[PDB]
Design an enzyme around this catalytic site. Structure first.
Site, PDB file in Angstrom:
ATOM      1  N   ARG B  64     -13.594  52.035  -5.031  1.00 34.27           N
ATOM      2  CA  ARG B  64     -12.198  52.367  -4.921  1.00 34.27           C
ATOM      3  C   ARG B  64     -11.342  51.295  -5.610  1.00 34.27           C
ATOM      4  O   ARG B  64     -11.369  50.131  -5.246  1.00 34.27           O
ATOM      5  CB  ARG B  64     -11.800  52.460  -3.444  1.00 34.27           C
ATOM      6  CG  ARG B  64     -10.323  52.736  -3.203  1.00 34.27           C
ATOM      7  CD  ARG B  64     -10.071  52.797  -1.724  1.00 34.27           C
ATOM      8  NE  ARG B  64      -8.676  52.908  -1.389  1.00 34.27           N
ATOM      9  CZ  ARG B  64      -8.003  52.010  -0.687  1.00 34.27           C
ATOM     10  NH1 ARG B  64      -8.542  50.841  -0.354  1.00 34.27           N
ATOM     11  NH2 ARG B  64      -6.770  52.290  -0.328  1.00 34.27           N
ATOM     12  N   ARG B 111       7.946  48.913   0.197  1.00 40.83           N
ATOM     13  CA  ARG B 111       7.538  47.547   0.393  1.00 40.83           C
ATOM     14  C   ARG B 111       8.781  46.660   0.477  1.00 40.83           C
ATOM     15  O   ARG B 111       9.827  46.995  -0.057  1.00 40.83           O
ATOM     16  CB  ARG B 111       6.573  47.130  -0.722  1.00 40.83           C
ATOM     17  CG  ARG B 111       5.130  47.518  -0.434  1.00 40.83           C
ATOM     18  CD  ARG B 111       4.178  46.971  -1.470  1.00 40.83           C
ATOM     19  NE  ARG B 111       2.860  47.512  -1.227  1.00 40.83           N
ATOM     20  CZ  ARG B 111       2.048  47.092  -0.265  1.00 40.83           C
ATOM     21  NH1 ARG B 111       2.393  46.064   0.497  1.00 40.83           N
ATOM     22  NH2 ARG B 111       0.900  47.713  -0.064  1.00 40.83           N
ATOM     23  N   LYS B 261      -5.231  62.353   0.706  1.00 44.00           N
ATOM     24  CA  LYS B 261      -5.108  61.435   1.837  1.00 44.00           C
ATOM     25  C   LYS B 261      -4.029  61.942   2.802  1.00 44.00           C
ATOM     26  O   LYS B 261      -2.839  62.143   2.434  1.00 44.00           O
ATOM     27  CB  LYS B 261      -4.786  60.011   1.356  1.00 44.00           C
ATOM     28  CG  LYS B 261      -5.802  59.412   0.390  1.00 44.00           C
ATOM     29  CD  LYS B 261      -5.370  58.104  -0.246  1.00 44.00           C
ATOM     30  CE  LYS B 261      -5.021  57.049   0.774  1.00 44.00           C
ATOM     31  NZ  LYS B 261      -4.505  55.828   0.120  1.00 44.00           N
ATOM     32  N   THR B 319     -10.427  53.004   6.865  1.00 48.53           N
ATOM     33  CA  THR B 319      -9.470  51.978   7.209  1.00 48.53           C
ATOM     34  C   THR B 319      -9.843  51.325   8.539  1.00 48.53           C
ATOM     35  O   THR B 319      -9.907  51.976   9.580  1.00 48.53           O
ATOM     36  CB  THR B 319      -8.021  52.471   7.172  1.00 48.53           C
ATOM     37  OG1 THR B 319      -7.754  53.102   5.911  1.00 48.53           O
ATOM     38  CG2 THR B 319      -7.071  51.313   7.386  1.00 48.53           C
TER      39      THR B 319
HETATM   40  O1  LIG Z   1      -4.236  54.290   2.358  1.00 46.63           O
HETATM   41  C1  LIG Z   1      -5.113  54.188   3.289  1.00 46.63           C
HETATM   42  O2  LIG Z   1      -6.378  54.168   3.037  1.00 46.63           O
HETATM   43  C2  LIG Z   1      -4.635  54.065   4.691  1.00 46.63           C
HETATM   44  O3  LIG Z   1      -3.381  54.049   4.844  1.00 46.63           O
HETATM   45  O4  LIG Z   1      -5.441  53.978   5.685  1.00 46.63           O
HETATM   46 MG   LIG Z   2      -2.919  53.083  -2.389  1.00 44.88          MG
HETATM   47 MG   LIG Z   3      -1.992  54.361   2.983  1.00 44.73          MG
END
Ligand SMILES: O=C([O-])C(=O)[O-]
Ligand SMILES: [Mg+2]
Ligand SMILES: [Mg+2]
Ligand SMILES: Nc1ncnc2c1ncn2[C@@H]1O[C@H](COP(=O)(O)OP(=O)(O)OP(=O)(O)O)[C@@H](O)[C@H]1O
Ligand SMILES: Nc1ncnc2c1ncn2[C@@H]1O[C@H](COP(=O)(O)OP(=O)(O)OP(=O)(O)O)[C@@H](O)[C@H]1O
Ligand SMILES: O=P(O)(O)OC[C@H]1O[C@](O)(COP(=O)(O)O)[C@@H](O)[C@@H]1O
Ligand SMILES: O=P(O)(O)OC[C@H]1O[C@](O)(COP(=O)(O)O)[C@@H](O)[C@@H]1O
Ligand SMILES: O=P(O)(O)OC[C@H]1O[C@](O)(COP(=O)(O)O)[C@@H](O)[C@@H]1O
Ligand SMILES: O=C([O-])C(=O)[O-]
Ligand SMILES: O=C([O-])C(=O)[O-]
Ligand SMILES: [Cl-]
Ligand SMILES: [Mg+2]
Ligand SMILES: [Mg+2]
Ligand SMILES: [Mg+2]
Ligand SMILES: [Mg+2]
Ligand SMILES: [Mg+2]
Ligand SMILES: [Mg+2]
Ligand SMILES: [Mg+2]
Lengths: 528, 528, 527
Positions: B64, B111, B261, B319
């Site tokens: 990744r 951010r 995601k 994560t």
């Molecule tokens: O972007 C990711 O992988 C997250 O927020 O867990």
């Molecule tokens: Mg990212």
């Molecule tokens: Mg994220």
């Protein structure tokens, strides 16, 4: 998906897609018309009512797959002529493999049985045993062919020593009951407790006895040799009590008889006890309910049937339900409600074959009887709950490292996935077809074989439809395989099993000879 | 004897899940190859060629690149090192391990600015204190404990009084008191130590941000240009977002896998429409665990993994899985449990972020995921899983789909060591994976990209075939099959006497898979 | 129907009525809010961070049900102080005598363990053990309270002999790894393989060695007498390796200690091996993953956890999941993603209790660690797939001729048929409540008892909410029964377990004394 809306309302498919058994029952539909070819084989006992070539022709058209020759009756000469007639009728349809159906021939043995003699009026005569009357049971050989309503001869010399005063003698699968009053030099003097029509050479059953009786008599040996000489397909072995009965039969058949299938008949308490050891050494089983239901309480026979069919299904070995299935049709053109129910329930229990005895051997409506078994079985087969059946066989059967076994479970699973019309299999001996049959596909198993005998013997396994391939080997073996598959597809078309655009599953092997089936293919049926 | 005591087979035989749990045994060693792919995020701790070689050997399948951090040049560097490390093993084609490269988009993230004391400085945000949140350009490099700058200019017109502003993985919390001309005067509800350029979350605030920003378009272009295999698309909220990613990728980028995601409430809400148009899903637990209550994330995880397993589409758990291993050599008891439960939940892939990007133990983090997944994969209750997936899958006339289920059924019957499949695109391999077989799916392909991409599907081991085509196609097919088995033997997935299922097609090109065969692995290098 | 179809959208009820597990997963919904009271009991370890009456009160408000005293640390005197503060905090809520929560006290033994000494600086101090540095492991009594970064004392005098050169000494659940370089007079000189922050009195784990430790040391016997004399409810018995270990504990507690629950801790390989014979003679089990996870391979611990909870659930005996569940909250206000998932999966595995160690004993956020366990457990409880769990217990468990058993399965089945808000049970010992808890009803088990000890102890079984009944007998027993039942109902209304129109199941017996439960009734909640 899009075979049509109509597709999924036929062959009880709403019931097939039920999530529970109970829901499956609730969704059975009298208006859902069966579609598959009838897959449970019909065995018809061949006798006076069913012996002529013309009659055998109509019995074949009505659905007869297996002809049973009972060596408790007739004679070698009689049974030889029965065979001649069967083979004439069978081969009359060989003109075009369009209506050519192999017919298997089974020899049913006498075995360790007790029988009465031939009546005074001869083997096709009858007398009336009357309630309340005096009847002498005798062992004196001068009465052997001179029985009547007062004196009954029996072929077990020792009955006198073995039966008690106040004890019962049963005749013809319990039709007639005699109670012993007196023992003496003349035989056993009896009173008739329950009467009826006595024929010649009828079965004798003795409660509270453990008759030791050879197993294979000298006559039995002549009968098995007759069987080998006339190239019968199947032995139905009467009164199999134990494994060694089955091995004695296998021995007497010899290496020349090595390919003959042995179906062990369970007819008494001991056979039920020793069932596991019997099944292990047998090719399959017959639940012989005539004898069984007078050897054990009548109210208990259904437990024996359900158990033996269950165990055979698990073992993947052929099982036959037999006797009194359409009894009333000996004199009536239509069966009782119990009789239709009994046939349907034998299919649902999981029988590979169902059988007619008196209904075809001596009755007035042999052809109608075959027709009726055909029509019920076809309805019952559509109502099998394959989902639970298949799931339970996975959970319960052993793992296997045999590649034909492994191929067959994948082939059958594949057949459900796409609603295949058929599974086409090449088989030398029947075995690859048998291993597909054991998972009970809805798809027809079309077994293409060069072996005339294998084509007859696969009728023992539910849902196997034999095709005798007659062409001599192609030069290239791969081309021979292809031509046989194409033969199966084209016979499928012309027999109404398949149509262009159906999916079929094809099961082949990677080299010649038995035991190398290891290929499963998915094909669309096209035109050329 | 020993065979039946490994791979948790005692537990696999259990009649209930409960009895399965009760039979799991710590002394039962896994023997299967590890089927859950490991995604390792590449960064400072993991981008040297040497480190990457160790990580490949530890089990890394997918690299990744997080485009939330680092220049294009930094990522291109990482890619070259990954490819060098990967290709260093190519002089052993029977053992060579493909490694996929995934580009993870920045997406609409918010951010904070750089602090007054610069990017190594940190300042204490004290709870009860008043801090202004400004979008005044002049504060971008001048953040302190009372002023924080934020790169979402429109934040001051979108966060109403009483709104919560989370900073740095949700560990700092601001509540807005007033919206002024200077921006959002706020009160520190939760306090903490604040650095530079830290993530901001605005839950129960609908943001205005585009979805694909000007950077994202640059980053997706970079992706096509450097031939990445996978986009992990951040903050997918709806199906139109996925399609925007597909459009930006262009005709050049059509074969790149899009994994959406799910990172917020709307994404969960719109999961079904998102999964429809996506190749797969990532449970991005970091953002999701701030956007929704932390104590609800496990429900979203299990829901999303279940639905993906139902759709036959890849799903990634990500994560903080081994978070402690950023600084420690051994993980916590919760962390090992997280990894095992992700596998038991049905994840196709598991992920490492800081643990491999910047931590002290990147290789051992990979080793630890490898070892846990292996243990968990043996502990999956196949009997239940297979049945539920069999039953949920639709009927199909597609021969690839038909053959897939037959082959998996067959694998289970013989406990096959592997299913070997030829595939050009990965699809025939995915359709096996979707039934969750215990057998390894060894996918043989000439396509380097497909070989990389199939790592997304649990249980698929890609082998890149490099030989020039045989003159006879059947011979070419056969060479690939035998290559699959020989790679299998060398890597120790297959041993002599094992059975393998082989899955092939009837002609060249995608979409003609229709053949299943059962072979034995012999000591010799040709198999039948 | 007439509950309002809003009722069938909360509490994960769509997922509850799935036909398959897989469908159940697909139906889990983050917007479906739990409604049942949280049923998995929270054990909090009491030390520095959790000593004050005010702190303990807040921990009780957050949802602490059992207080754990670890006798591997402190002293009799220290734990006596802890006990006094726990009881004062507990009794501060006896004001409103139906917002009173019993809190059990568990004594956690040393058992056959090896430990390091006290540092220079005292038990509050820490030193860094540096990777690559040289550390001396000594048995010399002069370092017993004089440990530092370079010499660590251990209380196993014979350690010089059991550890080879080139063998590993692990410290504090495998946090620190030492490798033995040379064996000599002073002890073992080692090189640090993995460094870390060392405290006082940390566990030593020796791989590939056998140690001869009694099972009950002289200190263990003093500690068990302490437990009896201070009226503790539970012994968590460390390093239970065999059935005899449990029986020795039970012997030492004596006739005075009869009613004290023994929860055997499984923390090493032998313990897993002998699980069945340990569970047989134990009241329950703790999956002690700290020690267990350095005695066996870390990637195996989850198998041991799921196996042991599965077997306890089948035996109908309480099981505790322990150690590192919310570890990061020792220093952080919020947990990691792995930690929340771990707590949820412990509940979904079927644990009766979840536990906090350092999170409450020594960390910055004791109260919020308890709150987090509470929040997660509540979500996870509504996500249990009751349909399959009930079916498989029914299938798996033995038939029974015990009237309490027979009544319990009936009661719980009845609770499901009507979505009863509660099952109210009268119990003297908790047994009648426990036998309902084994079938994992969605309905709260409200256990009405006069035994304060029983009322503390039933926290060990999931779903049991104790109501301590304080009134004196009635002339007629039957009137006393009906008043205890009325107490149950009025208590449930007040605590928001119940409203008028709820159904409840009521479980009672035909005479007084233990062992005669045999009645189940269906009542509408009146007026
Ligand atoms: O972007 C990711 O992988 C997250 O927020 O867990
Ligand atoms: Mg990212
Ligand atoms: Mg994220
Ligand atoms: N080949 C035959 N010749 C004359 N009659 C026959 C013949 N086969 C059968 N039958 C008659 O039909 C009846 C029923 O046939 P079936 O074959 O059931 O014989 P069975 O006497 O009951 O003995 P089993 O117990 O072997 O069935 C016989 O009892 C006999 O009356
Ligand atoms: N009573 C106490 N006094 C001082 N510190 C304590 C006390 N109880 C616990 N702690 C601290 O919290 C840490 C973890 O608590 P825990 O009860 O898990 O002990 P442990 O050393 O892990 O032993 P066990 O294996 O029995 O858990 C201890 O190692 C210690 O630093
Ligand atoms: O069912 P059986 O008797 O094992 O026979 C199946 C055999 O038939 C075949 O398909 C064809 O064999 P032949 O060419 O010898 O007929 C073999 O590949 C396979 O091994
Ligand atoms: O999985 P996909 O992409 O459909 O590819 C499967 C295809 O691979 C093959 O097995 C071999 O095809 P190629 O020779 O084109 O590689 C085909 O027969 C089959 O249709
Ligand atoms: O759960 P236990 O300890 O067996 O207690 C159950 C007992 O409680 C009762 O309901 C009431 O008993 P007491 O009146 O002695 O409190 C009995 O009927 C029953 O046997
Ligand atoms: O022999 C038979 O066929 C019987 O008895 O049923
Ligand atoms: O002792 C404990 O509680 C442990 O080791 O997990
Ligand atoms: Cl370290
Ligand atoms: Mg006969
Ligand atoms: Mg007879
Ligand atoms: Mg008969
Ligand atoms: Mg008979
Ligand atoms: Mg302890
Ligand atoms: Mg601990
Ligand atoms: Mg411990």
């Amino acid at each position: 998906q899009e075979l049509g809306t109509a597709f999924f309302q036929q062959q009880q498919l709403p019931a097939a897609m039920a999530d529970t058994f109970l829901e499956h029952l609730c969704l059975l539909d009298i208006d859902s018309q069966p579609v598959a070819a009838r897959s449970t084989s019909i065995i018809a006992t061949i006798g006076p009512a069913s012996r002529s070539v013309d009659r055998l022709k109509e019995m074949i058209k009505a659905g007869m797959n297996i002809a049973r020759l009972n060596f408790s009756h007739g004679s070698h000469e009689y049974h030889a002529e029965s065979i001649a007639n069967i083979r004439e009728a069978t081969e009359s349809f060989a003109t075009s493999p369009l209506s050519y159906r192999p017919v298997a021939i089974a020899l049913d043995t006498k075995g360790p049985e007790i029988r009465t003699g031939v009546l005074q009026g001869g083997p096709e005569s009858e007398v009336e045993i009357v309630k309340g009357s005096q009847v002498l049971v005798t062992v004196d050989p001068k009465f052997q062919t001179r029985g009547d309503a007062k004196t009954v001869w029996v072929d077990y010399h020792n009955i006198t020593r073995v039966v008690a005063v106040g004890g019962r003698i049963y005749i013809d699968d319990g039709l007639i009951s005699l109670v012993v009053q007196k023992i003496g030099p003349e035989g056993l003097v009896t009173e008739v407790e329950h009467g009826g029509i006595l024929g010649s050479r009828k079965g004798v059953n003795l409660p509270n006895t453990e008759v030791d009786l050879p197993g294979l008599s000298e006559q039995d040996l002549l009968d098995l040799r007759f069987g080998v000489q006339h190239n019968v397909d199947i032995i139905f072995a009467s009164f199999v009590r134990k494994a060694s009965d089955v091995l004695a039969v296998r021995d007497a058949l010899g290496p020349e008889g090595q390919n003959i299938k042995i179906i062990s008949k369970i007819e008494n308490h001991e056979g039920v006890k020793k069932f596991d050891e019997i099944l292990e050494v047998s090719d399959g089983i017959m639940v012989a309910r005539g004898d069984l239901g007078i050897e054990i309480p009548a109210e208990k026979v259904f437990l024996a049937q359900k158990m033996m069919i269950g165990r055979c299904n698990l073992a993947g070995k052929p099982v036959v339900c037999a006797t009194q299935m359409l009894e009333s049709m000996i004199t009536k053109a239509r069966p009782t409600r119990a009789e239709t129910s009994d046939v349907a329930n034998a299919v649902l229990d999981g029988a590979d074959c169902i059988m007619l005895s008196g209904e075809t051997a001596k009755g007035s409506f042999p052809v109608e009887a075959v027709m009726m078994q055909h029509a019920i079985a076809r309805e019952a087969e559509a109502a099998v709950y394959h989902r639970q059946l298949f799931e339970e066989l996975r959970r319960a059967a052993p793992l296997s490292r045999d590649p034909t076994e492994v191929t067959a479970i994948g082939a059958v699973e594949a057949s459900f996935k796409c609603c295949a019309a058929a599974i086409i299999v090449l088989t030398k001996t029947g075995r690859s077809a048998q291993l597909l049959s054991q998972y009970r596909p809805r798809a027809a198993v079309i077994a293409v074989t060069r072996s005339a005998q294998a084509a007859r013997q696969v009728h023992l396994s539910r849902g196997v439809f034999p095709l005798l391939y007659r062409e001599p080997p192609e030069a290239i073996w791969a081309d021979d395989v292809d031509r046989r598959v194409q033969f199966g597809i084209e016979s499928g078309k012309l027999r109404g099993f398949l149509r262009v655009g159906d999916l079929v599953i094809v099961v082949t092997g990677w080299r010649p000879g038995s035991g190398y089936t290891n290929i499963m293919r998915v094909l669309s049926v096209s035109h050329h």
